[PDB]
Write a protein that binds this ligand. Structure first.
Ligand SMILES: COc1cc2nccc(Oc3ccc(NC(=O)c4c(C)n(C)n(-c5ccccc5)c4=O)cc3F)c2cc1OC
Length: 308
């Protein structure tokens, strides 16, 4: 009933299906799927891409939902720190297909968890002992990038609504990208999504006003960003460790209960998390302010690493 019906620029976005060779499925959702593919001449060069399309026997409403996803991607536009649309297959002859840039390291949560034994706060010479290690610089840099992607999203007058580390993808050269799997995520088989009424909701990432009043704003996205920071500086742990996500949890959150400092945080990063978790939405920092602050922390962190 909405976004799928926005105008489409075929001369800009249309990619020939014949120039696309589909390979292995990457991820399987409730309605749609993401498939690894080789594409030729998308940017006379071959490139690995991610192709979102619908599963066999998709309904009309599922078709509408994928088209709505495509139009939202187009509206948002290009930024380094957002998963970028490379093209689309919308013409008669074959299925609706959305082609985005391939991020080879996958989601940030799983990736960070794989590096628990490959993290040092700062490398020490000889640095080859810490080859491919994560450092404080990496984590602050990831945080900084997501804040810039979220500032960009805000400037498009968009609200994410599902900001989390599972929705951050890691590309080449330590470049992180904000995304949403949407139709290609199975939220009914995902423990991050909790049943509250008719819907499955990411309760551990949701601001109190969102939980109680159903209010989604850019300011509740900032709350979510604070939970993401906690995920980054726990190296991909799950929020509110061991805590039952019930009525008591929601009550205590409204009353001012917050998560403790995660294992790999700096004092400055933890205060930033707490700032993002202000009970008053108006009192949370903006994403512009988060970009500024995290830029300052990235800079301060560099002064702690001066060997070279
Ligand atoms: C190696 O492992 C993988 C690499 C992968 N690499 C790239 C892509 C992959 O899957 C996808 C993930 C996300 C999306 N995103 C969309 O379709 C998006 C839409 C419609 N909007 C509106 N947004 C958006 C953008 C900004 C802010 C709010 C939402 C979207 O991100 C598309 C995908 F194909 C991968 C899956 C992998 O395994 C599962």
């Amino acid at each position: 009933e909405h976004c799928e019906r926005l105008p489409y620029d075929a001369s800009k976005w249309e990619f020939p299906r014949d120039r696309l060779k589909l390979g292995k499925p990457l991820g399987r959702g409730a309605f749609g799927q993401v498939i690894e593919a080789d594409a030729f001449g998308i940017d006379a060069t071959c490139r690995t891409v991610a192709v979102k399309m619908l599963k066999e026997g998709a309904t009309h409403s599922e078709h509408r939902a994928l088209m709505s996803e495509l139009k939202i991607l187009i509206h948002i536009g290009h930024h380094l720190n957002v998963v970028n649309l490379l093209g689309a297959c919308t013409k008669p002859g074959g299925p609706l297909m959305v082609i985005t840039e391939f991020c080879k390291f996958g989601n940030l949560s799983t990736y960070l968890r794989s590096k628990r034994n490959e993290f040092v706060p700062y490398k020490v010479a000889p640095e080859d002992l810490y080859k491919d290690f994560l450092t404080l610089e990496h984590l602050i840099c990831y945080s900084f990038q997501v804040a810039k992607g979220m500032e960009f999203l805000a400037s498009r007058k968009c609200i994410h609504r599902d900001l989390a580390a599972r929705n951050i993808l890691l590309s080449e050269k330590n470049v992180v990208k904000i995304c949403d799997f949407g139709l290609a995520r199975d939220i009914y088989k995902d423990p991050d999504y909790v049943r509250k009424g008719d819907a499955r909701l990411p309760l551990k990432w949701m601001a109190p006003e969102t939980i109680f009043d159903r209010v989604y704003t850019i300011q509740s996205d900032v709350w979510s960003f604070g939970v993401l920071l906690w995920e980054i500086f726990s190296l991909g742990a799950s929020p509110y460790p061991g805590v039952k996500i019930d009525e008591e949890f929601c009550r205590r959150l409204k009353e001012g209960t917050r998560m403790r400092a995660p294992d790999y945080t700096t004092p400055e990063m933890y205060q930033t998390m707490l700032d993002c978790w202000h009970g008053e939405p108006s009192q949370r920092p903006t994403f512009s302010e988060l970009v500024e602050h995290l830029g300052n922390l990235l800079q301060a962190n560099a002064q702690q690493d001066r060997h070279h």
